[PDB]
Amino acid sequence: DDKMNTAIKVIHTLKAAGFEAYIVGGAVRDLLLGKTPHDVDVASSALPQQVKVLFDRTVDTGIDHGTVLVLLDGEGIEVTTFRTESVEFVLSLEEDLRRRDFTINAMAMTEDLKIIDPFGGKEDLKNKVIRAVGDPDERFEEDALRMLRAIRFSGQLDFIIDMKTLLSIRRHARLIRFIAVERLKSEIDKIFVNPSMQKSMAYLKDSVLTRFLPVGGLFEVDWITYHTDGNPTYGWLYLLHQQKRQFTDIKDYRFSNEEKRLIEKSLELTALNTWDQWTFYKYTLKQLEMASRVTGKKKDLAAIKRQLPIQSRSELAVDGWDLIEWSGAKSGPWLKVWIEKIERLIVYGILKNDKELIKDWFEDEY
């Protein structure tokens, strides 16, 4: 929101102390597209320690990369010294811009809203073109993840990829093997929740990226019936469900245990023929919803789960030690078997969730 004013204030402070400073990258892009930026980056001739002299409150984590986060007027503005990439501090803005990924991200704006656009980002932004800065072969040898980022931008912005750039990706797709799988997963996640994602996936295959990406051919499913729920995990589940595959097949992308669980449990639900009270009790609403979404069902899952006699084990009126008293048997694995017998009868609404009456039933059944 208020980031632009703050960034301009930061720029003003930098220049008052004799440095050059400009808004660079995505903020210029977003502003020229009529969008209000989410992140606003400032490029400056100041070196990092010179930035910290000029502002009372800075965060120093990216300092080795030349980035200082300035904390001002409620916002955080990144201030980065002119640099290329292992970081080299250059002395001019254009040396920094020359090496950025795409023309629409290679622009700068001055304090008085003048645009510096040495590589035609203005025209590429108008024609909706993602084009590498300068020689695309270099840009992609410099950071192979840019090949995948080109695809992510195409969907995020509803742009096409410049043909010369796209052919360069095809020639260099093999280089993607060197990229940490965390950065690939992060870009794929953005694609999975971003607009025109079918064209993004078509670019992923046409670019030859699916030939070299980890288990990359698994991305080559039919994506027409896919509609994001805003959660990238649904793209991974859609992909597995389509091919009738399991989570192990994508474990290379290093999912968190939480994501892995949501996927695995959702897949189990898709394979479960009939859902009953016990299904709605044991599975989370997010798993029920994700599974029903991928199979095309549209029931009110929340209402069915709320109407169960109980919601989880902590409400059960009986625990293993109650059974130990009534049974006169020592504690053992048998308790979980019998607690679940009782739990089922309560969830199906046959047995009342009541210690006394569970005891009556248990003394009868044991």
- Is 101 annotated in some ligand binding site? yes
8-state DSSP, 329: P
Distance, in Å, from the CA atom of 308 to the CA atom of 325, rounded to the nearest integer, reads 29
Nearest Cα neighbor of 29 from 104, 98, 100 is: 104
Distance separating alpha carbons of residues 238 and 221, to the nearest angstrom: 9
156 among the known binding-site residues? Answer: yes
Output the CA–CA distances (angstroms, integers) from residue 95 to 88, 99, 132, in the order listed.
11, 7, 15
- CB burial of residue 34 (10 Å; 0-12, 13-18, 19+): exposed
| DSSP-derived secondary structure for 97-131 | HTTSSBGGGS-EE-TTS-EE-TT-HHHHHHTTEE-
**CA dihedral in degrees (142, 139, 197, 234; nearest 10)?**
10
- What contacts 299, CB < 8 A, 6 or more positions away? 292
Q: Do 253 and 274 meet the contact criterion of CB atoms below 8 Å apart?
A: no
Give the contacts of 75 (CB within 8 A, at least 6 positions apart): 2, 3, 6, 7
- 160-to-25, 63, 165, 226 alpha-carbon distances in Å: 19, 35, 11, 21
Q: Are 33 and 125 in contact (CB under 8 A)?
A: yes
- List the structure tokens of 277: 């009270």
Does 152 appear as a known binding residue? yes
SS3 content of the chain, % helix, strand, coil (to 5): 55, 10, 35
Residue 211 labeled ligand binder: no
Amino acid at site 305? K
**Closest Cα partner for 164 from 181, 153, 150?**
150
Resolution value (Å, 1 decimal): 2.3
For residue 155, count CB atoms less than 10 angstroms from its CB and return exposed for 0-12, middle for 13-18, buried for 19 or more. Answer: buried
> How many Å apart are CA 139 and CA 94, to the nearest integer?
15
For residue 108, list its beta bridge partners.
24, 116
The technique by which this structure was obtained is X-ray
**Residue 60 annotated as part of some ligand binding site:** no
The phi, psi pair for 43, rounded to 5°, reads: -95, 140
Question: 């698994």: which residue's tokens?
Answer: 218
| Residues ending a continuous segment of the chain before a break (C–N > 2.5 Å) | 85
Residue 356, C-beta contacts closer than 8 angstroms, at least 6 positions apart: none
| Tokens of residue 139, six digits | 């840009």
Beta bridge partners of 102: 132
Would you say 146 is a known binding-site residue?
Answer: yes
Q: Report whether 259 contacts 240 (CB < 8 A).
A: no
Close Cβ partners of 28 (under 8 Å, ≥ 6 residues apart): 107, 108, 109, 115, 121
Residues forming beta bridges with residue 76, ordered by sequence position: 71
| 29 annotated to bind ligand | yes
